[PDB]
């Protein structure tokens, strides 16, 4: 019963017959007519076992009296029946045949012979021999002779050459090759040359070949000669009702390895020629394939229905396979589903039918019937069940009091989505829910439907109140954002309530409490918003968490006094003196979780749930048509626009225009018609109720009842009233590019044919996009989950220094992260200061929560270094400090939580909602460039010479707020280190002109530049003023092509001008499009430019999935000066000559614009040409730490943009799963350039830079996979043939022998064990204390 | 629907599916991984063995809760030693290392 | 179907999302009742015993 | 009768059912000044004005 | 207790040590047939021992006091 690990290996023909109960020698089923097992057959009693319990097939012994006989008339020993599931036979072949996994599956037996495939078949299909051993030094082992050529060495040898066909060739190759002596052979002449692409052809070769020597398999275990046989009840062959039979697909295809078994042996003694015994042979082969793998070596062997005969793997492989349909999910007692409807309840609560709730609790009803004397036996409380007497209603009352049930809905995209609840027995047949759980279940009641689980035990009863129950969750787990937000009528009764109206009735009349503010609304003599004056008393924690009280009047409407009597007793007031939409509700119940606590937040929520239905049906609101309202003045703006279209309709027609102008000035023009007719709708809307007071007029915001949906934000937006009110704007036909007409009529006056017709090319092109993408993001869950499986956070200090630096996102324009929220929950790495030095505010490790957060938005710190998970130490998992807060509760976090399957749940979610020149200085702050390289120019401002050079703007206090990319030889309209306030275009370039401007103040002639050779001769015939031109590589003429235009600034001796304080000479090489504006010998200043040279969901996958872009940018191995090469042979060099460094090139295409220049120095991990890059290389050149930057920063740019908020340690929590294998570079434990685990690596230089050893370990490079690589590529062998490939899997498992030593979350899923995460975690490190000491 | 104890499968001893099989409810990949984000382990063992696939500890569970004593006894599934008969007559010898 | 009177607004969160709330008088009147038929097959075979 | 939510209205953008609702009440109205000129036994007559 | 275990988790320190303490504790109310030392208030065995826990009464180290001290009194009337 009890077990460690999973060992794979070859199963030797010695082992095959040890789990063996007989040979199978016949293919013959069951007796026709007594349908009884007939002897030596498939279903045989004698092999697999009797049929019945405790008989035999003719019936001499019965009843358990005989226990250990073997019925000497039949054979059939008297045992159980539940052996026929068990016990396995065997099939000696009387050919030995290949096996097709270790053949087929990309190649494990001609990687082993080093023959290819392609060769390999010639051989097995008895086309072509194949020399096993010439003695003779003509032929060489494993040389293939035809048919015609073995005749001929036949008579030219005699005995003197071994050569065969068939299985019978491979399987003694196999025998004769020594794998000992080929370690010792590989290994020498491994030295000779390690030429890159044939390395790691060696390298395949040398691990299985270890592998064969280590794991103790032989490889002559490729060839089958013994085939075993599955026990017949996992192959049935089961009668029907009418009398007919339904058999598995497995018995057509053993029939037919034993039919053409016994058909070999019957060729054999009659001495056959040997074409009829070679296509037996060959029809052998294709039987024992088919029953394998079916599809896979030829035409798959389909039955008498013209599908295919489902083979043993397609059992194993795929959807419908055991490891996905029966293994990972499974069908469930104790269970059932029905139609959800509304609900009265609490929140911790649920409606449960009786008729329901009779039938999962009917073996808890049966332990009371029999307690309570109320039943004899067991079989008397069946009867009282099934007749619903008056009892059996009382002790399921009983029965389910305090007994939490989960409840269910499909698909479960995240944790939320099955919740615990304890039961109110309702007399119906529909399940009744809380209103506010259904936002976390994403259920409406339009006819879902949820299903129900009864937790058995007495631990699943106390998960589901202590660990899953619905008050335990209402924070989310992706952010920390509340989750139990009042979502539609809840906040139309709260806007309405809580309202203000000029006119209404008791206007200003005083009140001492609001107790009487409701005796005022129920007699009638007040109205609900109605300014008065409320005496009020409030409570604060100003005390060491004791209420002190203060009394004041307030100036406050009726109807908020009524709804003070409801937040509890630690808030201040000003929470509910406005006019309360859909946000102010979510942060009233925000603000109370965070003073008051988790028990007065539940309470809270209910009571805003009563008070939310309760008074919106006081109200009455309705929609009408006269509630959808018209801007008068719409007719007359359509005919504003439907004068300009016939304006440029008759230019088109004259022909000033033409059609590409016109387009866009079309499209122009309807679209600030349409903003317009959507403005004076809404000038129409929000203020119609012109309403006067003791006087002669005022305004006030209206009480439309669709604006007062939208302005609470109850349900619907502004741009949803706008097709009701205003045109419903342009329409795209699915080609890609946009109908000419608007859709100018709305849903209110109708539309028409044409446009109707037109709304139904996107309203469809929308409607099969939301079907189409939900298979793209399940995928990519799956994904998700399989790379972060066996994270388990497993330790509390790891005890590592410092980690991601943080920082805002305030590029390209205003702040859209600041730090208080992508730093809130982590924790400090180093001790931090402010710009004020000398003040740490940390023992180098603190929680940094929402107070230390206002401590960093009083201060000008705007940049901290927090611990990241990617960094954590830990070997097999993290540490909770460097995970930081658990988002879901609001602390830090606990161990043995697995928070990899967090992370995936979070990425996934919203993963079916998102398928769908100059600088100006906007505001007052500091103008400070950085990495800065620049040059006065010819004006007197400054000019900028490098691209690693950005614009940031600092205030008055010290914090970044603006950043600004500016290019090579841009002109900036002032300096540096100043304040110049906004509304400034301070920077400007040509965004044609690429220029090479110049620092060196000089005059310039023409040297090394001959017309004919490298130039031309092209004047502005308009102007005059112009130059010679340098064009691209390939346009100009082959007399000086090979070497570079060099354009020397000169002085009056003659010599190159240098940069001052620097002595290497400064001069730009030309590359193309390079025309200089004027002419030889004039001068240039400092910064004076010698010439002007012109011009979603699958964003997600491709990043995790770590796809390679189209056009690589390409980047910089080394620093110092780079060169260049050859001249059009394919591409071009990039010869790198450093200061110190030693002869470097790359295929570089010449026709990809670069940066640097022939003569710039340019350094490592710095950029060449333009263009994405990889994130294969990121992780080359740059550290660890810049890979993870850039994915977390370019997989939230497509969350963030749809409004979706999650946090960044879900990212980088799964970033960190996809950097865990590492190559080695150097040796002397392991091999030299061999894949390998990082944990296993840091362990091994752990064990010898360590005192065991002075310095004997290995220095390793670090690799990254996708998803769906780095998953298959893992140390447990389960986890990835349960994932995809199954085949592929364990085809390169078994001839490893690897072992599963069972630590995912995943691998005790399957053998029915407890996980190691969450309640199961505190178990099994007893059995890792148990394992070491005995 | 609803359903207690009923009908089981017969290769793989799972319940049936469907309400005209009484016929017990799915509970798939994606609900383990939402008991896996909790962490009830105990939840989750008991779905898998007891509920589900283990012939001979379902009916202890069953006369357990009669007797008052809700104790769960589980034992190995028997859909893993289905596959481990399949992987077996694939010729690959899977085994397990026990203690 | 029927045709009845409906009142479009909000009445105590009996119809919050997609609910709707229906009147006893409905019932009563057998508006809603449909007669459903079905057909039970019992079937007995030749048997070997 | 029935009593619906005002909320799915806007949003759906559906306005058939408002201006079938107020149809449906401007045809009602029609037999319900039939049924009271059928109850109170006017004329033949004055049945074929309305 | 009986609608929010919060109060509980303190006087443990986690979610998933409060469930292997009251479990253990609702086990020996269930078949041991121990008494317990609250008012029942006609709770079941897993809201009483969570009700134990959260007044102080149910520790990991007294449930693993007093399962040794009672095996030492077997200890003694055997020999």
Redesign the interface.
């Known amino acids: ?12 023909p010695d ?2 017959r040890s ?1 063996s109960f007989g040979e199978v020698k016949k293919p013959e089923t069951i007796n026709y007519r007594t349908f009884k097992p007939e002897r030596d057959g498939l279903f045989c009693a004698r092999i697999f076992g009797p049929v019945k319990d405790y008989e035999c097939l003719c019936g001499k012994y019965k009843r358990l009296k005989h226990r250990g006989v073997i019925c000497e008339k039949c054979g059939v020993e008297v045992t159980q029946t539940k052996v026929r599931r ?1 016990r ?1 036979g065997h099939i000696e072949l009387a050919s030995p045949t290949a ?1 097709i ?1 270790f053949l087929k599956s990309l190649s494990r037996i001609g990687l082993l012979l080093d023959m290819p495939l392609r060769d390999i078949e010639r051989v097995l299909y008895f086309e072509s021999y194949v020399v096993i051993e010439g003695g003779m030094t003509n032929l060489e082992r494993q040389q293939i002779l035809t048919e015609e050529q073995y005749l001929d060495a036949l008579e030219e040898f005699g005995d003197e050459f071994d050569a065969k066909m068939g299985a019978e060739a491979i399987q003694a190759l196999l025998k004769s090759m020594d794998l000992e002596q080929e370690c010792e052979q590989l290994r020498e002449e491994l030295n000779e040359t390690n030429s890159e692409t044939k390395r790691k052809k060696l390298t395949k070769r040398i691990k299985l070949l270890e592998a064969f020597v280590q794991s103790g398999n032989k490889p002559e ?1 490729m060839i ?1 000669t013994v ?5 017949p ?2 192959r ?1 062959l ?1 009668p029907l009702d009418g009398g007919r039979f339904a058999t598995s697909d497995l018995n057509d295809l053993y029939r037919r390895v034993i039919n053409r078994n016994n058909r070999l042996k019957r060729l054999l003694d009659l001495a056959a020629p040997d074409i009829i015994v070679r296509n037996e042979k060959r029809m052998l082969q294709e039987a024992v394939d088919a029953l ?1 793998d079916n599809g896979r070596r030829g035409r798959a062997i389909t039955g008498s229905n013209k599908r295919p005969l489902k083979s ?2 397609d ?2 492989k795929g959807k419908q396979g ?3 349909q ?13 139609v959800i409807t509304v609900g009265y309840l609490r929140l911790h609560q649920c409606g449960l039918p009786k ?3 009779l ?6 009803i ?2 009371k019937l ?2 309570r004397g109320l039943a004899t036996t ?1 079989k008397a409380a069946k009867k009282m069940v099934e007749r619903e007497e008056a009892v059996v209603w009382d002790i399921l009352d009983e029965v389910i009091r305090e007994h939490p049930v ?1 409840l ?1 809905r ?9 919740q615990a609840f304890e039961p109110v027995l309702i007399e119906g047949k529909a399940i009744q829910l809380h209103p506010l759980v259904c936002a976390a279940y994403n259920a409406d009641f339009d006819g879902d439907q949820m ?3 009864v ?7 106390l ?2 109140r202590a ?2 129950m619905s008050t335990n969750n209402i924070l989310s ?1 992706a952010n920390g954002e509340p989750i139990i937000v009042p979502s539609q009528d809840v906040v139309l009764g709260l806007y309405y309530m809580t309202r203000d109206c000029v006119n209404a009735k008791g206007e200003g009349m005083v009140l001492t409490g609001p107790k009487e503010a409701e005796r005022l609304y129920r007699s009638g003599l007040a109205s609900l918003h109605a300014r008065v004056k409320v005496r009020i008393t409030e409570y604060e924690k100003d005390a060491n968490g004791e209420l002190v009280a203060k009394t004041s009047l307030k100036d406050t409407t009726v109807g908020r006094a009524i709804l003070w009597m409801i937040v509890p007793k630690g808030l201040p007031y000003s929470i509910v003196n406005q006019a309360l939409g859909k946000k102010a509700i979510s942060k009233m119940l925000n603000t109370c979780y965070r003073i008051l606590g988790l028990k007065p937040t539940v309470i809270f929520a209910d009571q805003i749930m009563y008070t939310g239905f309760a008074y919106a049906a006081r109200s009455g609101a309705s929609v009408g048509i006269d509630d959808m309202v018209i801007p008068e003045k719409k007719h007359e703006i359509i005919s504003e626009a439907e004068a300009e279209v016939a304006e440029i309709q008759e230019q088109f027609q004259s022909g000033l225009v033409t059609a590409g102008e016109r387009y866009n000035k079309v499209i122009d023009i309807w679209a600030a018609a349409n903003d317009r007719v959507s403005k004076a709708m809404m000038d129409n809307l929000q203020t119609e109720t012109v309403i006067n007071r003791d006087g002669q007029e005022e305004k006030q915001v209206s009480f439309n009842s669709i604006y007062m949906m939208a302005d609470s934000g109850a349900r619907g937006s502004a741009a949803q009233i706008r097709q009701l009110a205003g045109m419903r704007g342009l329409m795209a036909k699915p080609d890609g590019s946009i109908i000419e007409t608007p859709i100018t009529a709305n849903f209110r006056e109708g539309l028409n044919v044409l446009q109707y017709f037109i709304s139904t090319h996107g309203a469809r092109k929308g409607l099969a996009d939301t079907a189409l993408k939900t298979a793209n993001s399940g995928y990519l869950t ?1 994904r998700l ?1 399989d790379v972060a499986q066996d994270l388990v956070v497993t330790e509390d200090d790891c005890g590592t220094h410092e980690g991601i630096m943080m920082t805002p996102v305030i590029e390209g324009g205003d702040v859209k992260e600041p730090l208080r929220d992508r730093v809130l929950g982590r924790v400090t790495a180093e001790d931090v200061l402010k710009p004020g030095t000398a003040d740490i505010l940390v023992p180098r490790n603190t929680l940094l929560h929402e107070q230390w957060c206002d401590l960093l938005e009083e201060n000008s710190v705007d940049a901290v270094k927090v611990r990241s998970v990617v960094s954590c130490d830990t070997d097999f998992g993290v540490c909770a400090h460097c995970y930081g807060r658990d988002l879901a509760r609001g602390h830090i976090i606990n161990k ?3 928070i990899g ?2 992370a ?2 979070s990425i996934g979610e919203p993963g079916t909602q998102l398928t769908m020149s100059s600088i100006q200085v906007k505001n007052k702050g500091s103008i400070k460039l950085s990495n800065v390289k620049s040059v006065v120019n010819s004006s007197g401002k400054l000019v900028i010479t490098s691209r690693n050079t950005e614009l940031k703007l600092i205030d008055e206090f010290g914090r970044t707020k603006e950043s600004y990319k500016v290019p090579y030889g841009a002109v900036l309209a002032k300096g540096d280190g100043e304040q110049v306030a906004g509304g400034e275009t301070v920077a400007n370039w040509d965004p044609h002109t690429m220029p090479v401007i110049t620092e060196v103040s000089g005059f310039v002639r023409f040297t090394d530049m001959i017309d004919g050779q490298t130039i031309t001769r092209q004047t502005d015939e308009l102007t005059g003023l112009s130059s010679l031109v340098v064009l691209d590589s390939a346009e100009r003429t082959a007399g000086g092509k090979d070497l570079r235009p060099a354009l020397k600034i000169v002085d009056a001796q003659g010599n190159d001008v240098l940069i001052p304080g620097t002595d290497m000479p400064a001069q730009y090489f030309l590359p193309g499009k390079a025309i200089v504006q004027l002419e030889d010998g004039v001068q240039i200043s400092s910064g004076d430019t010698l010439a002007r040279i012109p011009q979603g969901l699958p964003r997600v996958a491709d990043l995790f999935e770590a796809r390679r872009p189209k056009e690589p940018a390409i980047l910089a191995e080394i620093s110092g000066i780079v060169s260049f090469g050859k001249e059009t042979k394919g591409k071009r060099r990039l010869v790198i000559t450093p200061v110190d460094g030693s002869p470097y090139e790359e295929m570089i295409p010449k026709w990809r614009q670069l940066n640097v220049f022939e003569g710039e120095r340019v350094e490592r991990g710095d950029v060449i040409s333009d263009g994405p890059e990889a994130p294969h290389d990121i992780l080359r050149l740059r550290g660890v730490h810049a890979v993870t930057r850039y994915i977390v920063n370019e997989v939230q740019d497509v969350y963030r943009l749809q409004g979706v908020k999650i946090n960044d340690k879900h990212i980088e929590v799964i970033v960190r799963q996809m950097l865990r294998k590492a190559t080695i570079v150097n040796a002397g434990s392991s091999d030299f350039l061999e894949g390998e685990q990082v944990e296993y690596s840091r362990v091994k230089i752990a064990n010898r830079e360590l005192e065991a050893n002075g310095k004997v370990g290995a220095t390793y490079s670090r690799d990254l996979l996708g998803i769906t690589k780095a998953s298959l590529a893992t140390e447990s062998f389960i986890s990835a043939a349960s994932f995809q490939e199954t085949t592929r899997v ?1 085809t390169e498992a ?1 001839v490893a022998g690897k ?1 599963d030593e069972l630590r995912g ?1 995943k691998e005790n ?7 190691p ?5 505190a ?1 099994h490190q007893d059995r890792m204390r148990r394992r070491a000491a005995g | ?6 009908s089981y499968s ?3 001893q ?4 469907g309400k005209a099989q009484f ?32 012939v001979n500890g ?1 009916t202890k ?2 006369k357990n ?8 006894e ?4 028997e ?5 481990l ?15 | 179907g029927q045709n009845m009177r409906v009142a479009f607004m909000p009445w105590n969160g009996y119809n919050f999302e997609d609910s709707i709330l229906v009147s006893e008088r409905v019932v009563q009147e057998d508006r809603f009742t449909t007669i459903h038929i079905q057909e039970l097959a019992c079937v007995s075979r030749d048997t070997k015993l | 009768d029935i009593v619906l939510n005002p909320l799915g209205v806007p949003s759906r953008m559906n306005i058939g059912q408002i201006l079938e609702t107020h149809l449906g009440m401007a045809a009602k109205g029609i037999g319900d000044k039939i049924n009271a000129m059928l109850k109170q036994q006017q004329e033949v007559a004055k049945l074929r004005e309305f | 207790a009986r609608v929010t275990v919060q109060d509980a988790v303190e006087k443990i320190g986690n ?2 040590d409060l ?1 292997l303490v009251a479990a253990r504790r609702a ?1 020996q109310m ?2 041991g047939g121990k008494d317990p030392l609250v008012p029942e208030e006609n709770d079941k065995t897993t809201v009483i021992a969570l009700r134990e826990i959260e007044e102080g009464l149910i520790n990991n180290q007294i449930l693993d006091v007093r399962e040794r001290q009672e095996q030492q009194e077997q200890e003694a009337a055997e020999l």
Do not use: C
Request: net charge negative.
């Open positions: 019963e009890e077990f460690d690990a999973i060992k794979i290996a070859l199963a030797s082992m095959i789990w068990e396995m096996h996994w275990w089958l085939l075993p046989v599955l026990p009840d996992l049935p089961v394998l043993l793997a059992m194993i055991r490891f996905r029966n293994l990972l999910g499974k069908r469930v007692d104790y269970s059932g589903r029905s008729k329901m709730a039938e999962l609790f009917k073996p808890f049966y332990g029999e307690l067991i989960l269910n499909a698909p479960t995209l995240h944790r939320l989505g099955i299903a129900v689980h937790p058995l035990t007495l631990e699943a009863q998960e589901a660990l899953m787990p799956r989950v043995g939580e697995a399957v967090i995936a749940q364990l078994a072992r979350l899923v399957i053998v029915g064990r407890l996980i995460a969450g309640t199961g975690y178990y | 629907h609803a359903r207690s104890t009923g017969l290769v793989t799972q319940p049936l599916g016929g017990g409810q799915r509970f798939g990949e994606m609900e383990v991984w939402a008991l896996e984000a909790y962490g009830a382990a105990y939840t989750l063992q008991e779905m898998l063995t007891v509920k589900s696939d283990d379902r569970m069953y809760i009669v007797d008052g004593n809700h104790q769960m589980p034992g190995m599934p859909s893993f030693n289905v596959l008969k399949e992987i077996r007559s694939l010729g690959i010898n899977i085994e397990l290392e026990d203690e | 979610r998933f469930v086990r269930q078949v």
